[PDB]
Amino acid sequence: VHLTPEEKSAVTALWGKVNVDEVGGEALGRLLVVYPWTQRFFESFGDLSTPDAVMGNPKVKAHGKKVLGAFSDGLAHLDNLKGTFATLSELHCDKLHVDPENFRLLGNVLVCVLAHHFGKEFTPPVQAAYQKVVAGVANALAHKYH
Amino acid sequence: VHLTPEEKSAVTALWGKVNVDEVGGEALGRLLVVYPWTQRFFESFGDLSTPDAVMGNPKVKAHGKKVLGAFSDGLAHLDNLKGTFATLSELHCDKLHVDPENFRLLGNVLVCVLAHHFGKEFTPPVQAAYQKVVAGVANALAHKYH
Amino acid sequence: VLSPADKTNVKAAWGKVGAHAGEYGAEALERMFLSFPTTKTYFPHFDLSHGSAQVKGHGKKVADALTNAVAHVDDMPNALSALSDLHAHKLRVDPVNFKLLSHCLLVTLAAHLPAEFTPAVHASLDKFLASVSTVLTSKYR
Amino acid sequence: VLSPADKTNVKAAWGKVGAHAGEYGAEALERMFLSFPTTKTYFPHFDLSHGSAQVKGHGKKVADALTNAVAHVDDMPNALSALSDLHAHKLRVDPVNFKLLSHCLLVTLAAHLPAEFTPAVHASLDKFLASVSTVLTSKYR
Numbered sequence A, B: 001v002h003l004t005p006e007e008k009s010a011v012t013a014l015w016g017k018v019n020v021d022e023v024g025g026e027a028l029g030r031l032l033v034v035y036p037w038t039q040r041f042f043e044s045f046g047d048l049s050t051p052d053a054v055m056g057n058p059k060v061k062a063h064g065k066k067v068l069g070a071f072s073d074g075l076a077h078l079d080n081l082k083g084t085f086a087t088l089s090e091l092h093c094d095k096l097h098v099d100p101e102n103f104r105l106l107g108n109v110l111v112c113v114l115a116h117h118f119g120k121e122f123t124p125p126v127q128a129a130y131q132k133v134v135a136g137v138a139n140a141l142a143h144k145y146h
Numbered sequence C, D: 001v002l003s004p005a006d007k008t009n010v011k012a013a014w015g016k017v018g019a020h021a022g023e024y025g026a027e028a029l030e031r032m033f034l035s036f037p038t039t040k041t042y043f044p045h046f047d048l049s050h051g052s053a054q055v056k057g058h059g060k061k062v063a064d065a066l067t068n069a070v071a072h073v074d075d076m077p078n079a080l081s082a083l084s085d086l087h088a089h090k091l092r093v094d095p096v097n098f099k100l101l102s103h104c105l106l107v108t109l110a111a112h113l114p115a116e117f118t119p120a121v122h123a124s125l126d127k128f129l130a131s132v133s134t135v136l137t138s139k140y141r
């Protein structure tokens, strides 16, 4: 992912101000609610039956943190996304057989969530740069299909 | 694209019977009919107002055998797809900005046309082997978006 | 959204399926399972071998449900509600899978009924099948 | 297909747009051009400088159509019949672009109205935006 070095740090900047214990869980939780067929990869998670049941589920928040961390790994190494997500790519593609359209959906709900949490500070130039980062994660995760 | 020895012989065997002058124009033509938003890329071709205007177009037909020819260079070197399609990747991605979902739909309409011509010769295992080639062509054509 | 001309092309071509319904449904299914093995994960309880009695039986119901949908083309949400509940609510089917079966239903219709598989009919059939998939993948209860 | 509870969420939440409509449809457009430069193809002569009056005008037309789509949620094919004419027959807009705009519409609703944008309302808005896109990329007349 090629960012104008403005971009590179306008993104680092929003990400330190990210509640690391709560935004993965909201992004993961909105995926399962907005795209309900995604709950199939997560049947081991118990109660997933209403938005409120999904959003307050402890397994969702726990897993949302591990997802967000993988993203944090991504922002750190924007020049090597395919080496960072190679282990994850194999997991999501070869074992879990997740259709890669879903990678893109998650990354865009993460954008709707960052926008939710920062409002007027998540501006078009700021989105624009996150769209490239999140396209890059999805591409890198989908590498085992390419 | 990793095919078996018999998948490879079954594919080679069915292609040899393909009329090089007609199948690609028939594939391109149904793309334009089945998915009309694709006509926007071929505005210099002339009349595409009706299904019979599309299928009786000498431009669609002439451009079709160009598409087919590139699929043919595909089957000839399935170990070197990315590079067979490197020049076309850049044209379709960087000059033309064709959404890669359209690469997948054209591959499928060609399968539909292969089925239509070869009927019961076009068997489940023969389709399966062609879907591999066709996803390989679309994934290689899309390489500039990766 | 289907055109008047779309409804007519589908009726005209599905109508010619007749007694081969379950043969085409089950061929479509086999086509799906061999072309895209990820789809198999939805049928862990089935024998999915070429000769399979379950595939042939399930082949029938899909095809008959499609005839059912042609007959109510003007408002399938109501005609296919038990089907919507099953696929969207209970099975949680990834809608990519509906694109795969649809493609395999057109591959079968091309191979069996080539006099009917004109571009216009092809176009209508593709639109029809997408309308159905949209219905079976949505939660509207 | 939208549920009865989808329509409630959409009507309720979209109704809070009011005077901000042309502001919101304009920002949504700007998010789309910045984030997705490929969408610029359809607007080759637009002025797209940050505050361009062309973009605010067009921003207003886009929002007022959505406001009217909500009013006719059970009758959109006929309600937005001419908008399909434009987008599908004339412009021949690739449906991928509808997803990219719909998403930017959702980012603009979350950034401005966080209290409306619950998970449930998010799902409903997403579905409602997909249903309008199907009407505007379809040919059915």
Ligand code: HEM
Residues within 6 Å of the ligand: A038, A041, A042, A044, A066, A067, A068, A070, A071, A088, A091, A092, A096, A098, A102, A103, A104, A106, A107, A137, A138, A141
């Ligand atoms: C696009 C961004 C995504 C990121 C950054 C991400 C990240 C992660 C990480 C770090 C793990 C833990 C891996 C481990 O501990 O070995 C994981 C597990 C998993 N992910 Fe993903 N993921 C993404 C997308 C998805 C999507 C879209 C789905 C399904 C719709 C999915 C399904 C799963 C499943 C089923 C597991 C492990 C199963 C379980 O713990 O129950 N992931 N993901």
Ligand code: HEM
Residues within 6 Å of the ligand: B038, B041, B042, B044, B066, B067, B068, B070, B071, B088, B092, B096, B098, B102, B103, B104, B106, B107, B137, B138, B141
């Ligand atoms: C996925 C399979 C495809 C293959 C193998 C393919 C192959 C080709 C080839 C061989 C050429 C000619 C290059 C030359 O000038 O020597 C070409 C040009 C072109 N292709 Fe494709 N193509 C594919 C899909 C598509 C799709 C989906 C679209 C748009 C919907 C498209 C639009 C075009 C356009 C607009 C040109 C330039 C034609 C002109 O001069 O107006 N192609 N392609």
Ligand code: HEM
Residues within 6 Å of the ligand: C039, C042, C043, C045, C058, C061, C062, C063, C065, C066, C083, C086, C087, C091, C093, C097, C098, C101, C102, C132, C133, C136
């Ligand atoms: C053309 C669209 C489809 C139609 C018309 C359709 C129709 C049906 C019908 C009639 C049944 C029988 C259920 C009953 O008797 O209560 C069924 C069940 C089922 N469907 Fe679908 N279906 C479609 C697409 C799909 C897809 C894409 C998948 C996933 C790959 C899928 C997975 C299943 C499964 C696992 C069952 C239950 C099988 C069993 O336990 O016997 N369907 N569907």
Ligand code: HEM
Residues within 6 Å of the ligand: D039, D042, D043, D061, D062, D063, D065, D066, D083, D086, D087, D091, D093, D097, D098, D099, D101, D102, D132, D133, D136
């Ligand atoms: C939510 C989906 C959309 C809605 C509700 C919408 C609404 C509208 C309306 C009402 C008009 C015509 C204004 C008038 O004459 O009264 C219009 C025109 C137009 N739209 Fe859309 N639109 C949507 C999506 C899109 C998308 C995704 C694109 C492509 C990126 C697009 C490209 C255009 C273009 C090029 C025009 C004509 C602009 C000109 O005057 O040159 N629209 N839209």
Ligand SMILES: OC[C@H]1O[C@H](O)[C@H](O)[C@@H](O)[C@@H]1O
Residues within 6 Å of the ligand: A135, B097, B098, B099, B100, B145, B146, D038, D096
């Ligand atoms: O990776 C970025 C690309 O994503 C999508 O495929 C777009 O349709 C394409 O035009 C864009 O350049």
Ligand SMILES: OC[C@H]1O[C@H](O)[C@H](O)[C@@H](O)[C@@H]1O
Residues within 6 Å of the ligand: D045
């Ligand atoms: O002639 C075509 C031109 O006129 C139309 O009215 C459009 O508004 C304009 O943007 C377009 O380039």
